[PDB]
Amino acid sequence: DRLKGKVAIVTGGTLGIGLAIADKFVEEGAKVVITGRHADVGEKAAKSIGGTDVIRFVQHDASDEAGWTKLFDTTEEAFGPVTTVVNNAGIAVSKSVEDTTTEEWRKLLSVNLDGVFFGTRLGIQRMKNKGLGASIINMSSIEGFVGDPTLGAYNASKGAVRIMSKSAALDCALKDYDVRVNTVHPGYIKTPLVDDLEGAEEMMSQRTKTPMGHIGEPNDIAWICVYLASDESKFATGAEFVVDGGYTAQ
Amino acid sequence: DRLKGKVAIVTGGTLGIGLAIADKFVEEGAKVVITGRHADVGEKAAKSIGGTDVIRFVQHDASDEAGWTKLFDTTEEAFGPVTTVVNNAGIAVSKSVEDTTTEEWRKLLSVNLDGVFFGTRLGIQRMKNKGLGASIINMSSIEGFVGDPTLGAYNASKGAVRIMSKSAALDCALKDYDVRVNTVHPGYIKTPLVDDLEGAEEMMSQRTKTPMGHIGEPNDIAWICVYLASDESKFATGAEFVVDGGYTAQ
Amino acid sequence: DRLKGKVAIVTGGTLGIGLAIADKFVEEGAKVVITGRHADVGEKAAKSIGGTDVIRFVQHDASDEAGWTKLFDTTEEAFGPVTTVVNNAGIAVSKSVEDTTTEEWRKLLSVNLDGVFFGTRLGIQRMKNKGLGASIINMSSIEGFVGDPTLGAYNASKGAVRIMSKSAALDCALKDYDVRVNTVHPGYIKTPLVDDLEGAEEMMSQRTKTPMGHIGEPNDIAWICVYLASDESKFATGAEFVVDGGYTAQ
Amino acid sequence: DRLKGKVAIVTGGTLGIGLAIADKFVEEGAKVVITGRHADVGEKAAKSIGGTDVIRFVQHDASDEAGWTKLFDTTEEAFGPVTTVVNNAGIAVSKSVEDTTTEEWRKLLSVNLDGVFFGTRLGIQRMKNKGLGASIINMSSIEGFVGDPTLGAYNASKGAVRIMSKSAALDCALKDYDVRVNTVHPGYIKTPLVDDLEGAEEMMSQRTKTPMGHIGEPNDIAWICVYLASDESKFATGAEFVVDGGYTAQ
C-alpha cells in the first residue's frame, strides 16, 4: 500500500533493525533486496519475509565497493529501477577513544562510514532524474548526536553519516534529482548488536539513559523508515529523525 | 486504519496545515475535533472533511484558558476520551525584534506559546494513565531552529515550544503516563499564513532558502503528524521532526 | 584590558552569575551598571567590585519595560554610550508542565523572556550604527537545549531566548548595525538560584547529569561573557556558547 | 599571561588558522610546536612568531601515526609536559558526494578524521592525570553542523570530528583525567584553503551565506582557541564553539 512500486536495497537486512525494515517494506508493497555477509542467516531471513517475487537475499559486505555496482544491477534486473536505498549495515566497538586500536578504528569506519558513502554515492548516480521519488535513508544513531565514553569510533562514524547525508540531500535538491536523503537516529534497540554490548540493555534501560525505562524494538525503526521511503515525506530531505525513547531529550 | 480508536483535538484545524492534519486523521480512522475562532469558516471546514460521526468543529481561541477545559469535555462527550492533542493554532508577525511592539509581542506569544502550554498541560492531566497510547503533537517550526531577521516574536515562540515539549515528554516518560510529546518543525508551507506574509512564497522558494526550489503543502505536515499520532511511533518522544525541503540542512 | 572602553549593562548583577560577570567585566576595563530589585543587596554588590568610577548599582526589574529606557539613560549619563548588554536577570520555578500554575508560568516568562526581549530590543535601538563594537549577551541555559521534567516554564523561556537572539543577531548583521547577539548556556552553577532548587547541587553533581562530577562556579560564565563582550569575538554572532561540564555532551 | 605554563601542539600551524592560533598562543605565554608537511614554509612560519625558546617547527603529516609519538616526545623534551593539543591540520575537496572519487574520499578522511583521532587518542594518554589542566581542541567547521552540496567528504570528516570529540570529553571527565575536549566550528575564514576554493570568498560573503557580508580572519579563530586552551574554560568540555559571522544562525 504505502510503498507501492518502490524497490528497496536494505543493507544488513538479515538481522535486527534491517530485518524489520525489510519486513515492513514488503508488507507495504515494496520489493526488497537485503544484504549481509553470512549466507545461511541471509537466506533464512529473506524466506522468512516472502518469496523471491517480493524479496531476495544478496551476500555483500557494505564496505565492498565493487560489489555495490553488482548489487544495484542485481536489484534492478530482479525488480526494476531501484527507488530506495537503506544504508543500515553497521557495527559497534566497545572502546573509548583512548583505548581504540587503529585496526578497530579503520574496520568500523570502513563499514559504518565508507559503506554508507558507497551506497549513497551510487544511489544518487543510479536513481537521479528518473521520476522515481527516490529516497536514501542512512542509519545514524543517537550516537550521531551525543557522545558515549566507550563508543569513540562509533560516535565518529555516526556523526559523519549525519552530516554527509545533508550534503547529498542538498546536492540532489538543488539539481532537481528527485532524490531525498535523510538520517534515522535510533536510540537503544533490542538487536543482536545490543546483545553483544555487555550489559547495555540493563544500563540503557535506566531512566537516566532512556526516560521510558526500556529500550525499543526493531519495528520502532522500521516504521519511521517506511515514512521516509514513501511519497508521504516528499518534502522531507536533509533532516534527522530520532526514535530513542527520550534519550536525547534530557 | 492507522489511527484506529484515536480521538484527536486539532487546534486551528479550519485552515492550512491544521485542516490537512484533521483531514488525514479522519482518513486514518481517528475521531477529530477542530477548533478556530471563526464559526462560519470552522463549520464549513469540518463538513468538508466528514460528518459529525468523525469530525466536529468547536469555536475556541487557544489562548482562552478556561475554554480549554470545556473543549476537552465537549470532545470527550462526542467521541470518548481524548487520545491525541495537536497544538497547531498559531500566528505570525512580520517584525524584527527591534521593530516589535510590546502588543504584537504579547499577542503572538499568547497564542503560540501560552496556547500550546494550556493544551499540553491539560492534555497530560486528562490523558495520563489511561492506556490510550496518548500523543501530544506541538507545532513548532524551522523558526524554532534558526532565526529570521523579521520574525523575532515568532522565533521566540517556536523556540519555547520546541524545548518546553521536551520537558513534558520527559515528565510523562519518567512517570509512565503513557503520553508522548513531540514537536513538528515545518519549513515554508503554502497556507493562508504564508499568503499573509508578503512575498514570502517567492522568496522562500529561492534555492538559498528552500533547496528544493519550492515550498511545501499542508499534506506534507499532515502525514508526519499521522505517524506521531499513531502507535507506530510508540518509542518516539521528546524529539523534533523536520519537514522543510532542506531549509535547515544548509 | 580586554574590555577597554566598553560600557556594560548587566541585569541581575547583584548575585551569582551576574555578579561574577560584572566583577570580571570591571577587571578587564569595562564600565558596568548592575541591576537588581533589592537595593540593599545591590548597593553592597556594586561596592564589593569597585567604586562608582567603574561600577554602579541601579534598582530595576528586568520585566519593567518603562524602566529599561531610564536604565539606559542613567548608564549613559554615568559612563557614556552603552556598548554591551548582558540580559542575565532570570528566575527558576521547580514545576512540571503538568503542575505549573498559570501565575507561575506568566511570572517566570515575564522575567526570563519579556525581560530579555525588552533589553535586546532597546539594546539594538540604542547601540546600532555607532561603531561601538556592540555586543548583546543573552543568558539562556542547557535548559534551552534539553528539557527537565520539573523545569517546564523554565525550559520554555530558555528555548525562546535561544532562538529569538538568533533573529536579532541576523537583523543586526544584515543591516550592518555593528551589534552582535549571542547566547550563553551555562550548566549547573553554584549560585543562590541553584541553592533555592532543593537538592539540585547533589543531584546534578551525579555523573549521569554532569560528567565532571561537580557543578560550576560563577566565574566559569563570567569568562565566556568577557570573550563575547570583547572585540575578540567580532566574527561571532547568532551562536550558542555552552559551559556545562559535559552535561549536554551525553 | 592567559596561557601561562601551557605547552601546545598545533597541527598545521604554519599557515592560515593554525598559524594565528600559534601566534596568539605564544603571545599569551604558551610554548608551541607547530607541524606541517613543507619544511620551508614551516621554518619561516615558526621564526615569524618567535625563537626556539617559545616556538619550534616539526615536519609531520597529521595522518602519520608513528610520527605522532615522536611529536609528543619532541615537544615534551623541548618545553616540558604537553598540556594543549590543537588538531587543526585539515584539507578540503570540492566535490559532491556523487562526484567524489574513493581516492579523494580516503585521502581527506585520512587527514581530517584519522589525523584528529591520532592526536586526540595520544593526547589523552599523555596528558591525563597530571594536573596540567589539559585541553584538546579539535577543529571542526560549520560544515560539521550543516551540509554543503560540493563538500561531501569534507562534511563527513567534520561531522565525525564533532561527535568523536564528545566521546573523548565524556571519558576524560568521568575518569577524572583533567583533560577537556572541545570542538571549534569556524565559518568561512580568509586562508589559503579558501583561496584554493574557487570563488568561495565572493560567494560566501553574500548575505544569504554569511549575514555579516564578509568572511572572517584567522585571528577570529585564534582567540576562541585561546579561551579553550586557558583555565578560564575549566568547566567547558564536550561543547561546540561557533565563530561564523552568523552563517548557521539562518
Ligand SMILES: NC(=O)c1ccc[n+]([C@@H]2O[C@H](COP(=O)([O-])OP(=O)(O)OC[C@H]3O[C@@H](n4cnc5c(N)ncnc54)[C@H](OP(=O)(O)O)[C@@H]3O)[C@@H](O)[C@H]2O)c1
Ligand atoms: N541496535 C541499536 O541499538 C542501534 C541504535 C542506533 C543505531 N543503530 C544502527 O542501526 C544499524 C543496524 O543496527 P542493528 O542493531 O540492527 O545491528 P545488528 O543486529 O547486529 O544487525 C546488523 C546487520 O548488518 C549485517 N552486517 C553486519 N556487518 C555488515 C557488513 N560489513 N556488510 C553488510 N552487512 C553487514 C549483519 O549481518 P551479517 O553479520 O551476517 O553480516 C546484520 O544483519 C546499525 O548501523 C546501527 O549502527 C543501532
Ligand SMILES: NC(=O)c1ccc[n+]([C@@H]2O[C@H](COP(=O)([O-])OP(=O)(O)OC[C@H]3O[C@@H](n4cnc5c(N)ncnc54)[C@H](OP(=O)(O)O)[C@@H]3O)[C@@H](O)[C@H]2O)c1
Ligand atoms: N505555514 C507555514 O509555512 C508554517 C511553517 C512552520 C510552522 N507553522 C506553524 O503551523 C501552524 C499552522 O500554520 P498555518 O500556516 O496553517 O496557519 P494558517 O494558515 O493561517 O491557519 C491557522 C489556523 O489556526 C486558526 N487560529 C488562528 N488563530 C487562532 C487562535 N488564537 N485560536 C485558535 N485557532 C486559531 C485559524 O482559524 P481562525 O483564524 O478562525 O481562528 C486557522 O484555522 C502554526 O502554528 C504555524 O506557526 C506554519
Ligand SMILES: NC(=O)c1ccc[n+]([C@@H]2O[C@H](COP(=O)([O-])OP(=O)(O)OC[C@H]3O[C@@H](n4cnc5c(N)ncnc54)[C@H](OP(=O)(O)O)[C@@H]3O)[C@@H](O)[C@H]2O)c1
Ligand atoms: N545558576 C545556574 O545553574 C544557571 C544555569 C543556567 C542558566 N542560568 C541563568 O543565568 C542567570 C543568572 O543565574 P543565577 O544562578 O546567578 O541566579 P541568582 O543566583 O538567583 O541571581 C539572580 C540575580 O538576578 C536578580 N534578579 C532576580 N530577579 C530579577 C528581576 N525580575 N529583575 C532584575 N533582576 C533580578 C537577582 O537580584 P534580585 O532578587 O534582588 O532582584 C540576582 O542578583 C539566570 O538567567 C539563569 O536562568 C543559571
Ligand SMILES: NC(=O)c1ccc[n+]([C@@H]2O[C@H](COP(=O)([O-])OP(=O)(O)OC[C@H]3O[C@@H](n4cnc5c(N)ncnc54)[C@H](OP(=O)(O)O)[C@@H]3O)[C@@H](O)[C@H]2O)c1
Ligand atoms: N579556512 C576556513 O574557512 C575554515 C572553515 C572551517 C573549518 N576550517 C578548518 O580549520 C583548519 C585549518 O584551516 P585553514 O583554512 O587554515 O587551512 P590552510 O590555510 O590551507 O592551512 C592548513 C595548514 O595545515 C597544514 N597541513 C595541511 N595538510 C596537512 C597534513 N596532512 N598534515 C599536517 N599538516 C597539514 C598546512 O601546511 P602544509 O600544506 O605544508 O602541510 C597548513 O599549514 C582545517 O581543519 C579546516 O578544515 C577552515
Ligand SMILES: [Mg+2]
Ligand atoms: Mg577512513
Ligand SMILES: [Mg+2]
Ligand atoms: Mg543529553
Ligand SMILES: [Mg+2]
Ligand atoms: Mg506573556
Ligand SMILES: [Mg+2]
Ligand atoms: Mg542554516
